[PDB]
Amino acid sequence: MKELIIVGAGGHGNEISWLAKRCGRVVRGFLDNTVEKQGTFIRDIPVLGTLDECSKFTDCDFVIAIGSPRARKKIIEHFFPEGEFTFATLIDPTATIGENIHIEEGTMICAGGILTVDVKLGKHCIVNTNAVLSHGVILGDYVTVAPNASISGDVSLGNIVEIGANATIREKVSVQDGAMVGMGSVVIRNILSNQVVVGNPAKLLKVIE
Amino acid sequence: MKELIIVGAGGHGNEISWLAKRCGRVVRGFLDNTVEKQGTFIRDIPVLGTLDECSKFTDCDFVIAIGSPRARKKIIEHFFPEGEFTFATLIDPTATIGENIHIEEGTMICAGGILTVDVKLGKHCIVNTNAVLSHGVILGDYVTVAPNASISGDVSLGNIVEIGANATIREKVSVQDGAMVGMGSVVIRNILSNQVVVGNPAKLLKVIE
Amino acid sequence: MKELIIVGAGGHGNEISWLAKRCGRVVRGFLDNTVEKQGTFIRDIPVLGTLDECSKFTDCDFVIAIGSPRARKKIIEHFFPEGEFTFATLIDPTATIGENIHIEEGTMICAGGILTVDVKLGKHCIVNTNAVLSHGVILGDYVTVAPNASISGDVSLGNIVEIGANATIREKVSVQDGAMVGMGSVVIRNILSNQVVVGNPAKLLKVIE
Ligand SMILES: Cc1cn([C@H]2C[C@H](O)[C@@H](COP(=O)(O)OP(=O)(O)O[C@H]3O[C@H](C)[C@@H](N)[C@H](O)[C@H]3O)O2)c(=O)[nH]c1=O
Ligand SMILES: Cc1cn([C@H]2C[C@H](O)[C@@H](COP(=O)(O)OP(=O)(O)O[C@H]3O[C@H](C)[C@@H](N)[C@H](O)[C@H]3O)O2)c(=O)[nH]c1=O
Ligand SMILES: Cc1cn([C@H]2C[C@H](O)[C@@H](COP(=O)(O)OP(=O)(O)O[C@H]3O[C@H](C)[C@@H](N)[C@H](O)[C@H]3O)O2)c(=O)[nH]c1=O
Ligand code: NA
Ligand code: NA
Structure with missing residues (x-):
């Protein structure tokens, strides 16, 4: 290499x-x-x-x-x-990469991370320590998933999205480009472009742009 | 097989x-x-x-x-x-099954799941991706534990209970038959039959039946 | 041995x-x-x-x-x-211990735990099931980290600190001696000596001493 x-x-x-x-x-x-x-x-x-x-x-x-x-x-x-x-493309030996996982270049999949089935990541993504991406999750380019994030089935994360540490995203939620989910947030609704959401349940804090 | x-x-x-x-x-x-x-x-x-x-x-x-x-x-x-x-009974090769673990038929223990010691599961249970069941946890029949759920020592989950993704259950809590704990909930009190609880701290939302 | x-x-x-x-x-x-x-x-x-x-x-x-x-x-x-x-010093075979990890005697690192780089633990610490300590984390003596706790980069935990199950600590937060973070808490501010904090976002509940 x-x-x-x-x-x-x-x-x-x-x-x-x-x-x-x-x-x-x-x-x-x-x-x-x-x-x-x-x-x-x-x-x-x-x-x-x-x-x-x-x-x-x-x-x-x-x-x-x-x-x-x-x-x-x-x-x-x-x-x-x-x-x-x-x-x-760096995948920790202790990360679990399942079936029909498509990862574009520059991406970092860290120790203990799990990507199950039919997960798609764009370029320059991070899936940090012990985070989980369940079936059918799609990440755009430049997505950051922090340690222990819990990304349920069929969630869509747009480009330049950040999901904070140990946050939880309900299945089939869409998060549009540039949004940020605060650490520990519990997200049960779609998030619009550049929105910062925090809390349980997640509420709009501000726009980041 | x-x-x-x-x-x-x-x-x-x-x-x-x-x-x-x-x-x-x-x-x-x-x-x-x-x-x-x-x-x-x-x-x-x-x-x-x-x-x-x-x-x-x-x-x-x-x-x-x-x-x-x-x-x-x-x-x-x-x-x-x-x-x-x-x-x-399906147990992912990357699940950790410790000592005196009793699992009845139809149960699915998914990737990264951990069942430590003296854990008992009934029939047709799910322990999803990266969830943890600590010492002395007891599950009835048809229990669903979602990804990243944190089920502390000596918790009892009745029949047809569902624990949502990345929820956390205090040690020695009992959850009666048919209850539902929302994703991300932080449960510090016993839950009664068919109750849906959500939030931090978890509060009663409604009854499911 | x-x-x-x-x-x-x-x-x-x-x-x-x-x-x-x-x-x-x-x-x-x-x-x-x-x-x-x-x-x-x-x-x-x-x-x-x-x-x-x-x-x-x-x-x-x-x-x-x-x-x-x-x-x-x-x-x-x-x-x-x-x-x-x-x-x-007991380290589960399924714990991940990375580089420049310094652990003093009496410490228990449990199944699925991850300590990445430049992590320092004092004596008689617990890092329980599936918890994560990211880069530069420092623990004093007698620290308890519960299952699934998410301790971000450069967090400092003083002596006799307890972090509850599946709690999340923002990077560079300091927690002074004897404090307690409740299970599921989302901590975004420094914590003072003997403070008990709970919730999302974590708020002061009481002093423990
Ligand atoms: C209740 C019932 C269902 N079905 C079929 C219909 C569907 O094709 C299938 C259920 O698929 P579904 O995707 O709607 O639901 P599930 O496959 O149960 O998926 C759900 O739970 C998982 C643990 C989560 N990871 C998913 O995000 C969540 O959507 O089962 C039957 O054939 N007969 C039935 O009686
Ligand atoms: C303080 C003290 C305790 N003990 C004995 C009494 C008990 O038999 C034992 C403590 O057992 P216990 O079950 O009450 O507590 P622990 O064994 O510390 O368990 C607790 O922490 C764990 C990390 C969690 N997983 C459990 O859910 C929680 O209950 O230690 C002594 O022999 N001497 C002492 O001075
Ligand atoms: C934006 C930008 C940055 N840099 C350098 C400056 C710094 O030395 C370095 C960034 O280091 P930093 O520690 O400030 O940030 P990061 O290395 O990105 O760390 C952050 O994200 C991680 C996922 C978390 N684990 C950390 O807790 C958090 O602080 O990059 C450049 O050389 N050029 C640039 O254009
Ligand atoms: Na894990
Ligand atoms: Na978690």
Whole structure:
């Protein structure tokens, strides 16, 4: 396999370097814009430079190990023009990937995650630790599912959606592009574009855009 | 082992055909009453006919792969007279079954489920994806536990109880026959027969019968 | 390895004797102060006597298999003077222990638990069934994390903290010594010493001391 460059040397890049190692990948290093992180390491893996150095590593696969959906879209659209770069798909050895699971490139499926049957993910998705996607779930591009999220059958998550940790989504709910479900929310109604919903039962807090 | 007939070719029958395959079972097909599903398939497994065709497959094990507790009881009582048919017990290879676990026939224990010690399940139970039943939990017949439910020590769930996804039940709580706990509920008090409770903390919504 | 003495022959001692067996340990027996439990067994393992008999088993490792943080501290401080006894560290074979995980003695990591990277636990901690501790989480001494708890990145749990089942803690939250988070709580703010918080969103209920 190609060596891997991890974009983002924060909390998620920390866990994704761990994921990559468990997947048998060689991680060349991180790219990160943080001044203070230049010349630093996570567990023997160096921060190589800033994101505009990505063109020096076209031989590598990339992954954008940043939780914020909009951050991953912003980075892909600025630094990663269509067809110039390749992206890894990282699936933890302890994740369960069932039948007729379709996952597009750049996606991270973390330890203990379960995708049962007929689940479709777009590009640069995250399914974090111990989250569950039941039958017929569809994710767009740049979706973040946090640890322990409970995504019931036939839920649709649009592009740049974020589902917070240990939230629960009723079967057949649709969540439109750019929405955010707060950690622990219990969602029993469809969510409209860019809405932030929180609580039990989930209620509209604000729009994020 | 006997070949398997799955009653119900919906979302749960989809996941239970997956479970059966992972358990090394040969699935003969589904029975389903849906007109539009006659002559259809899930992943090479045909819908063979309607439920009244069950008498043509007495050579097979059956499982009732329908989430609603009352649906499974209704189907067993109409179509499956005592002692005429055999039922499979399906335990995902990634489920954890500990010590002194007693599971009666027709039960489905799904991927990532954990039953620790001294857990007793009656007939035709479901313990769905990544749910946990702690020490001394007792389930009656036709109990449905949804994905990620958190059933603490010494909880008692009566017959035809349903616990919604990622709900949490305090230790030593009793839930009487036919009750329903909504998804995400946090249950800290005993629940009476046929009560529907929802929320954090769970409150009585209505009676289901 | 040394044989093991389990202090506490209740629900948690039941599950920890199971854990010990799965870890390939020989359990000599339980110590328990309950009159009615003298001469009793859990799955072939006897209650040997009361806690003041611990000095007859200095050849053994001990574990304090009692959920209440304050109970474990009380027992260690009364019966287990510094340097007289050794404590087991029990990690279920199905727990995931990642990289740069530091766990001090007496700790129990239960089935399906996940500790990702840079997690630090003090002495006599519990991480129960299917709980998740994300990057940079720090636990003090005598912390109890209940089943399915969702402890996000960089959370700090002080000494004698208890996090209830399937609760969710926002990243970078600090919980000071002796606090309690109720089952199912959704914690988005720092918690002060000995505070009990419950609900979604978590609110102060009372002080425990
Ligand atoms: C948006 C953006 C970010 N970065 C860098 C800055 C930081 O070093 C890094 C982001 O690190 P961070 O720790 O602030 O955030 P993340 O690594 O995304 O972590 C977040 O999501 C995870 C899923 C959670 N587990 C964490 O608790 C949460 O803080 O990415 C860039 O280099 N360029 C960018 O354009
Ligand atoms: C009650 C009843 C049902 N059926 C058939 C009709 C349908 O094709 C099938 C039921 O399919 P369905 O998708 O409507 O429902 P289920 O397959 O039970 O799925 C439900 O529970 C699961 C645990 C959840 N994961 C799903 O999100 C939820 O929709 O069973 C029969 O053939 N006869 C019956 O008597
Ligand atoms: C405080 C104290 C207790 N004990 C004994 C008495 C009991 O037999 C035993 C405690 O048993 P118990 O069942 O009351 O409690 P625990 O074994 O701690 O169980 C509790 O925490 C677990 C994590 C949960 N899964 C259970 O649902 C919850 O009840 O310890 C002693 O022998 N000495 C002590 O000083
Ligand atoms: Na799990
Ligand atoms: Na949960």
